[PDB]
């Protein structure tokens, strides 16, 4: 069933405690900050973008994201990087490019999509 919902951010995505994302009809952009006492390198990260699954986290630690995506993405046109100041960013290209997602992964509360503003 459905559960309690969150108000969408100005980018039509969600602000969660550990990450935030925005979207258009065709893509989604995620930011995942890490607060660590070392320089964040690829070797420290396990990130796996699958057709309908996403995993993001530090090696040896509980993943920050590890869940079923709201809908399918084109892996070949999706990507991630470690941006300055230890912020991991992920870009997802949607397969159905005319659909508002209500959440990144199924374990997150949905945003209230009634409040989406297509113009942004």
∠ CA 105-111-116, rounded to 5°: 125
CA dist 46 and 9 (Å) reads: 27
Tokens, residue 46: 């396990």
Query: What is the torsion angle, in degrees rounded to the nearest 10, for the CA atoms of residue 114, residue 116, residue 119 and residue 120?
Result: 160
Q: What is the resolution of this structure in A?
A: 1.8
Q: Which CATH class is domain 1-120?
A: mainly beta
Experimental method: X-ray
Any residues with CB less than 8 A from the CB of 60 and at least 6 apart, and which? none
Q: Residue length, the chain?
A: 120
């Amino acid at each position: 069933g459905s559960s309690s919902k969150l108000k969408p951010n100005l980018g039509n995505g969600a602000d969660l405690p550990n990450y935030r994302w925005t979207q258009t009809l065709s893509e989604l952009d995620l930011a995942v900050p890490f607060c660590v006492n070392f320089r964040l390198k690829g070797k420290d990260m396990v990130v796996d973008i699958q057709r309908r699954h996403l995993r993001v986290g530090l090696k040896g630690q509980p993943a920050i994201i590890d869940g079923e995506l709201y809908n399918e993405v084109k892996v070949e046109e999706s990507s991630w990087l470690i941006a300055d100041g230890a912020v991991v960013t992920v870009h997802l290209e949607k397969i159905n490019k005319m659909e508002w997602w209500s959440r990144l992964v199924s374990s997150d509360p949905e945003i209230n999509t009634k409040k989406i503003n297509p113009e942004n």
